[PDB]
Design a protein around this ligand. Sequence first.
Ligand SMILES: *[C@@H]1O[C@H](CO)[C@@H](O[C@@H]2O[C@H](CO)[C@@H](O[C@@H]3O[C@H](CO)[C@@H](O)[C@H](O)[C@@H]3O)[C@H](O)[C@H]2NC(C)=O)[C@H](O)[C@H]1NC(C)=O
Lengths: 98, 8, 220
Amino acid sequence: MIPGGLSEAKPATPEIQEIVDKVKPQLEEKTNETYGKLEAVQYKTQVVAGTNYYIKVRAGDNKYMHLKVFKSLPGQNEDLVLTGYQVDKNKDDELTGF
Amino acid sequence: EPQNCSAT
Amino acid sequence: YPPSMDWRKKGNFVSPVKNQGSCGSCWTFSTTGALESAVAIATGKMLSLAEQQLVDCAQNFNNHGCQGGLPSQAFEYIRYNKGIMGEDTYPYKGQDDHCKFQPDKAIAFVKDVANITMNDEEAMVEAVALYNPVSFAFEVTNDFLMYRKGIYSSTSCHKTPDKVNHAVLAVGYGEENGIPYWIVKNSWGPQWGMNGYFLIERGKNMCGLAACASYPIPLV
Ligand SMILES: *[C@@H]1O[C@H](CO)[C@@H](O[C@@H]2O[C@H](CO)[C@@H](O[C@@H]3O[C@H](CO)[C@@H](O)[C@H](O)[C@@H]3O)[C@H](O)[C@H]2NC(C)=O)[C@H](O)[C@H]1NC(C)=O
């Protein structure tokens, strides 16, 4: 559990879920797709000048995606940002830095 | 001994 | 040791506050912090060392660029690697790049590295008081994010080396009304907290201040 690394994997929470719902329009403004429901399945946190969520989202029968959102620091006025996303992920693929 | 904290 | 200590006050020994962004480079910011201070304390030259160097090359001393690392190990990198350049010659980018170290351009050196025993807070108190600002790690819970002023205490963190997650620079220590604290330099830009700074409660190994801390002896 090094400094600046990623936390252990934790199950997703209602806040995480919310994050994925606030962020889902962004995944879409980029992939130009239209996903159905995206369900927060698991996640990891990383401490930067703010937080970097690494969300494992279940969206498609047994199709999983790995989104990466950066949450700003309470300070200035800024929302969640989709700073990355891996697609074609499995139910077990471990969440990781990227 | 090496600092165990930022290791594994 | 004095009831208080503060390298900023003593002089041009502490660099400006740096911003590290969305990259897990906070460890590199402890390292560059300490060393800068050491050099200055020892010579009067205030230098701004490049963190990307550590982000791009420390790999061997068990670090992992933007996804983490520890300052002690960073110090070893600087030693064995034989130097570290500063910002103007190796700009900070926040992402994983491949090493661009250039030997004739390193501007700061590490001769040896002082490792403050595990959980030994007073040794930090000594070092910070008698020799240098100490680079350190601790568990950062959400509370911590809101931080604006005063002395940050926590009943949320647990002082174990199983979840410390943020390296910082102890630039002093002191006392407030009766509660003891640490004067700490952070790497989140001057806007956060007390102009980049925060004050954690001293004496309880709060969040693990004393878990894996160090300071470096500069080759000068
Ligand atoms: C202080 O804590 C640091 C952080 O764990 C310890 O760093 C280790 O220091 C040793 C030297 O005692 C380094 O050894 C060197 O390794 C390089 C890598 O290949 C190589 O050139 C040499 O073979 C050399 O032995 C080691 O890299 C480093 N380990 C880590 C994980 O960074 C250090 O041991 C502690 N110092 C004291 C005095 O206890």
